Enzyme design. Structure first.
Site, PDB file in Angstrom:
ATOM      1  N   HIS A 205      11.651  -0.252  -0.815  1.00 17.49           N
ATOM      2  CA  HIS A 205      10.402  -0.078  -1.565  1.00 17.49           C
ATOM      3  C   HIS A 205       9.346   0.737  -0.819  1.00 17.49           C
ATOM      4  O   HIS A 205       8.472   1.319  -1.441  1.00 17.49           O
ATOM      5  CB  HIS A 205       9.801  -1.397  -2.119  1.00 17.49           C
TER       6      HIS A 205
ATOM      7  N   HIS B 243       2.713  -0.088   6.391  1.00 19.46           N
ATOM      8  CA  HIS B 243       3.483   0.722   5.462  1.00 19.46           C
ATOM      9  C   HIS B 243       2.494   1.473   4.576  1.00 19.46           C
ATOM     10  O   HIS B 243       1.284   1.239   4.655  1.00 19.46           O
ATOM     11  CB  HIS B 243       4.380  -0.155   4.590  1.00 19.46           C
TER      12      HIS B 243
ATOM     13  N   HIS C  37       1.901   3.323   0.456  1.00 12.78           N
ATOM     14  CA  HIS C  37       2.263   3.543  -0.929  1.00 12.78           C
ATOM     15  C   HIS C  37       1.835   4.969  -1.248  1.00 12.78           C
ATOM     16  O   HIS C  37       0.770   5.406  -0.790  1.00 12.78           O
ATOM     17  CB  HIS C  37       1.543   2.555  -1.856  1.00 12.78           C
TER      18      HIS C  37
ATOM     19  N   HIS D  86      -1.400   0.407   4.452  1.00  7.49           N
ATOM     20  CA  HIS D  86      -1.663  -1.025   4.578  1.00  7.49           C
ATOM     21  C   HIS D  86      -1.236  -1.515   5.961  1.00  7.49           C
ATOM     22  O   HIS D  86      -0.054  -1.485   6.280  1.00  7.49           O
ATOM     23  CB  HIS D  86      -0.901  -1.786   3.506  1.00  7.49           C
TER      24      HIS D  86
ATOM     25  N   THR E 275       3.273  -6.436  -3.638  1.00  9.90           N
ATOM     26  CA  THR E 275       4.666  -6.507  -4.061  1.00  9.90           C
ATOM     27  C   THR E 275       5.089  -7.969  -4.118  1.00  9.90           C
ATOM     28  O   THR E 275       4.466  -8.826  -3.497  1.00  9.90           O
ATOM     29  CB  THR E 275       5.616  -5.746  -3.110  1.00  9.90           C
TER      30      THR E 275
END
Ligand code: EVF
Ligand code: EVF
Ligand code: ZN
Length: 258
Positions: free
Chosen positions: A62, A92, A94, A117, A197
């Site tokens: 993801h 990570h 997005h 994040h 998530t």
């Protein structure tokens, strides 16, 4: 991994397996800058990353996580809206298929190309798994990315992505300094929210920096060459791995700055 960001398992489907998706404290949210209240009681953030120990980078299907040694207090977030000490476990991003989307939080409905994040857990709960079960368990520091000049401190991340193209691949990622991913100012907005998530648990104090960092088009293009799929499987580019803004409901966003 039954959930994802595909045409049939994206954010609008998550509630069927994670009913908290329709909860009262979901993230991300749109930050309406005129409605957010300056709170003079908020303190400056304390980001203490001098002793950070990065270990590994993982494509988890993801996003990619840069993982840290969180077995002691060597990279911690304190201050700001927080009580106590929060240990950095991973960061990570997005991001989007094009520069006009990718961020999770939005600012007066503006979307950024990506959002970083930095995930931290409250040491009073002893481990991450216990922390996510508590309303003050996590502190996630969110940083917007816009496309312009290159971010020098991001390049080491960019350059290892070829080696973790597909889900389940990892690589050594030692001696990375996450201070190289910060903007100049630590002015922030803060509100109570959730993991974005699954399992979408309502355990996060969000701290979203006002100042975006600039990354180059070439850097973000490399994010977009990653794959959601495993090795040898039909290629599905890892793009648009962001959850859209969720209802603010009965929550107040506070600003650290006038
Ligand atoms: N998003 S989810 O509720 O977790 C989900 N969507 C789908 C679609 C097809 C097969 C399994 C799942 S599981
Ligand atoms: N995207 S996020 O809210 O920073 C986040 N979500 C999740 C879900 C499961 C485990 C860790 C994290 S960190
Ligand atoms: Zn995230």
């Amino acid at each position: 991994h039954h959930w994802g960001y595909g045409k049939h398992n994206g954010p609008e489907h998550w509630h069927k397996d994670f009913p908290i998706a329709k909860g009262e404290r979901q993230s991300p949210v749109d930050i309406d800058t005129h409605t957010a209240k300056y709170d003079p009681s908020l303190k400056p953030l304390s980001v203490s990353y001098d002793q950070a120990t990065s270990l590994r980078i993982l494509n988890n299907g993801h996003a990619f996580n840069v993982e840290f040694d969180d077995s002691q207090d060597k990279a911690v977030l304190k201050g700001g809206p927080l009580d106590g000490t929060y240990r950095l476990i991973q960061f990570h991003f997005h991001w989007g298929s094009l520069d006009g989307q990718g961020s999770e939080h939005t600012v007066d409905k503006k979307k950024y190309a990506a959002e970083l994040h930095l995930v931290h857990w409250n040491t009073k709960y002893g481990d991450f798994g216990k922390a996510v079960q508590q309303p003050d368990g996590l502190a996630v520091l969110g940083i917007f990315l816009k496309v312009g000049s290159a971010k020098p401190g991001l390049q080491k991340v960019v350059d290892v992505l070829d080696s973790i193209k597909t889900k389940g691949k990892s690589a050594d990622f030692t001696n990375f300094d996450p201070r190289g991913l910060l903007p100049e100012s630590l002015d922030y907005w803060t509100y109570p929210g959730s993991l974005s998530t699954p399992p979408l648990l309502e355990c996060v104090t969000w701290i979203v920096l006002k100042e975006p960092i600039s990354v180059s088009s070439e850097q973000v293009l490399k994010f977009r060459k990653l794959n959601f799929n495993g090795e040898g499987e039909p290629e599905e580019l890892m793009v648009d791995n962001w959850r859209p803004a969720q209802p603010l409901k009965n929550r107040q966003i506070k600003a650290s700055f006038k």
